[PDB]
């Protein structure tokens, strides 16, 4: 039991139930959070009708800001990545930036296109409140304004959730007054690739937004593909995942290198600085990317299996780069230093007021007044 | 310190030694060890090394899938939000013996995947602790809050690894990382036993003692040292001869500076409880709890229907495993001095299982077929 | 008028619902306990007038004129 | 508000509001109709920012006990002490010679003044609902 | 007797074939297409190296086109 609302395309919205529309704003609207005992809040920052940055808020003390280009902050600081903290593990996944909260219950991504996704849980049933709408199975009455009344205009509904903070005051939002050649949107209605998602969801609304976008078409093939990922992800979460689409006309969702976009990748994503513990990856299929099969992933990019560097004291060394100790030395194999033991000299220091050091290493203080035997 | 007439003996924990020609002659017997979490940022290897390492994801306490032999067990001690010792800290332990997990979290045990060898699988609730027996040698002792201990008998000698060392009798080399290299400071040692490769390894705290939550007051730094100097005050002066309170004091200075406690005093009583527990293993039982210093009661679960039959008391260390209609024969519980609240019913009418009321021996299982309770 | 709904529990903190504007409300509504007003601290206690400022700024839409109101 | 000890963390001022927001949780909801929990909340927020507790926790339980004292004067006795929230015991003084005869128990408010060989007559004790550990002999 | 699995990923020079370029090992010589009776149980041939085109495209005489055409 876990739903999904997403912000995608350019100026589009989907809720926890399906009723989906458009909106372009300026004022960091409220995307989720119970409105009787708040206890956390997801806030979605926009800019000039676009989607810039994403942020949570725990209580009234802790902030985190995530941004679309992968830079993360603290409210006034600039933290690195991954950065685990008081709950709330920022990480990376099949190539996307995941923010996981399991004590409270939610998980939020941001992919290369800057598309947001948040998955809630079953204990927030009939208690969510924000812009993603309430969470009950009945899918029609999901426009309750902050007053509690119900409306019909998307803009009048969604302007009641904007949040302003001090320096940033915000205005009322007005629909853009700008109106408008191939129809590839029906690719959801002809081919048998999508034919198995038909008895779970109705492909009409997606065609509707697809022609809405077709109106714009500031480009060659950008018209339809952002309208096509979302339907795949929706009917994937609905219970049956589509297999091997994108092989006909899709526009290759982007991730940096390797580009091996595929469905059903294990989030564990075996690399070579690992303990190869099996049996403990019980996570569902997640779309994303990776890099072929014969390569293992490093922190930046992924390298062939023959070149996993070793680590000492957090440094990285290329294979066959023997370090030298005082007593011994040994050589980096495939991430497995192999030294040979050998006895090396010992020293017994006696310094300070009364501070000794044994032959092995034990440090201590004695301070007695007589003659004593130090070695023999 | 003391005199010893010739021919007299002395026993040290596990072995006995006698005087022969001004020199002690006595026998060797490698016997069991214990790796434990002293408090909530410090560890104690099998050979008695103390180190500091605060992390926040899943790590490896002790396993044996590292040598040139097929592994058997594996215990993982992933903790939640304990990169800082605040009161919000919670810990979880998962045990993978043959084909199951146990999930020590919050209340009690789970059995999420039955083991095919329940022939030596027990769970015991005595005092304020829970005792798990997982094989001929392996045991786990749990406080129910934050202290986890593990006992291995002499069979597993030189055959394990993890954040608890390799159990061979040498301290110096028992700090090796997962890739066969001996580190220098504990922080870069412990990153190597991390299970998931997406944890943001802890960096390093550069400062000295009295963490930053202290030393800016020294009105709070000089109350903490005296508040838990009771480790040397009047009850522990007999312990101090046998085990030195140098490391446990330095645990107490930590995680009391760094632990903003408001109405929950558990962040402080548990360190003193650890030191007292270690004394009890040396035959030096102590009593230290007053009416104004970490008080404890166990009269709440006292049959509210009538209650006049006061069947519960708080004892010093309450010998550990008592038979009932659960395991009607003595076990091998490696503690024998569990502090807690204890039931002292007369020789007849032993204690029951579920309703916590001593009853006459009729209410034992009818038969032991299929290993079921059978009332 | 008997058709008006009787309100239930009054709520004290409005910016538990708009956490974006928590820093601004505390920072701005702090002139009242500052040497600018020090002469008047002995004439009327600025205790109610401070929590009023915090509530006004956290709650109302246009906090620019709620501050100086 | 929030003396100089607080408002410099707000990882502690957000931990002391919810630590003693229990005055409105589930048991005191009867009191909230008859006595409002507003001044006692301000009492609790204070002297817990400015009271660093290390091994002693009376600096916090006393405020809750004072509010409970106020409630019981209005005939709304409550029970709030658990094993993990300000625990209390009184069986230490239980005749250690034998101990099996338990004559002391912890009651809700243990009505105040009882007769014995001290004053064999009723007194004027204007509380009559004194919480504590009590003896209930036949 | 032991076919090599998943090489060519390090330093190979991509052995050339006209279309698809999906050089891979252990490909069935049955080479399923849509102009066939989808008869199974009669692909009992050992592994052979060669080429094909992804998975979602079926081979025609000249090249391979999506299943819809
Ligand atoms: C990802 O996007 C964010 C925002 O879209 C980028 O952050 C922005 O970075 C610029 C460059 O430093 C910041 O401008 C600077 O602002 C300071 C303070 O006003 C000023 O003193 C400097 O002279 C400069 O103008 C800008 O404030 C900042 N915006 C934020 C943090 O909201 C970020 O750089 C992007 N990531 C990458 C890798 O470029
Ligand atoms: C949601 O909760 C309200 C109030 O608790 C109730 O009236 C309503 O029927 C609930 N809706 C559903 C679908 O259960
Ligand atoms: C100790 O005593 C035993 C028998 O009493 C003897 O065999 C052994 O050699 C003695 N060892 C030493 C070191 O004296
Ligand atoms: C604890 O139990 C043991 C065994 O029943 C008993 O000898 C001892 O007196 C008890 N301690 C107390 C304080 O009652
Ligand atoms: C408290 O005392 C009164 C009067 O003796 C009694 O009726 C009541 O049951 C007692 N409360 C408890 C919890 O024992
Ligand atoms: Ca709904
Ligand atoms: Ca060793």
Author numbering:
A (entry chain B): 31 to 210, 221 to 416
B (entry chain B): 833 to 1207
C (entry chain D): 556 to 624
D (entry chain D): 1041 to 1178
E (entry chain D): 279 to 347
Sentences from the paper on this structure:
One extracellular protein family that arose through domain replication and gene duplication is the gel-forming mucins, huge glycoproteins that coat and protect the epithelia in the lungs, intestines, and other organs. A remarkable variation on the theme of mucins arose with the evolution of the complex vasculature in the vertebrate lineage. von Willebrand factor (VWF), a glycoprotein responsible for hemostasis, has a similar domain organization and is homologous to mucins in its amino- and carboxyl-terminal regions. Under acidic conditions, the amino termini of mucins and VWF form noncovalent intermolecular interactions that juxtapose VWD3 assemblies from different CTCK-linked dimers. We present residue-resolution structures of VWF and MUC2 amino-terminal segment tubules, enabling comparison between them and an analysis of the features that stabilize each one.
To compare the two tubules in more detail, we produced tubules of the VWF amino-terminal segment according to a reported method. Due to furin cleavage during recombinant protein production, we assembled the VWF tubules from the D3 dimer and D1D2 fragments purified separately. The VWF and MUC2 tubules also both display twofold symmetry perpendicular to the helix axis. They differ, however, in that the VWF tubule is a one-start helix, whereas the MUC2 tubule is a two-start helix. The VWF tubule has a helical twist of 86.0° (about 4.2 subunits per turn) and an axial rise of 2.85 nm per subunit. These values are in close agreement with previous results, which reported a helical twist of 85.6° and an axial rise of 2.62 nm for the low-resolution reconstruction of the VWF tubular scaffold. Density maps showed that the region around the furin cleavage site was exposed and flexible. The region surrounding the furin cleavage site was disordered and could not be modeled, but its junctions with the rest of the protein clearly indicate that the cleavage site is exposed in the “window” of the VWF tubule, which has dimensions of about 7 × 6 nm. Thus, the structure of the VWF tubule is consistent with furin cleavage occurring after tubule assembly in vivo. The MUC2 tubule thus appears to be stabilized mainly by quaternary interactions between turns of the helix, whereas the more rigid packing of the bridge in VWF appears to dictate the geometry of its tubule. The residue-resolution structure of VWF, presented here, enabled an analysis of the molecular features that produce the tight, one-start helix previously visualized only at low resolution or by homology modeling.
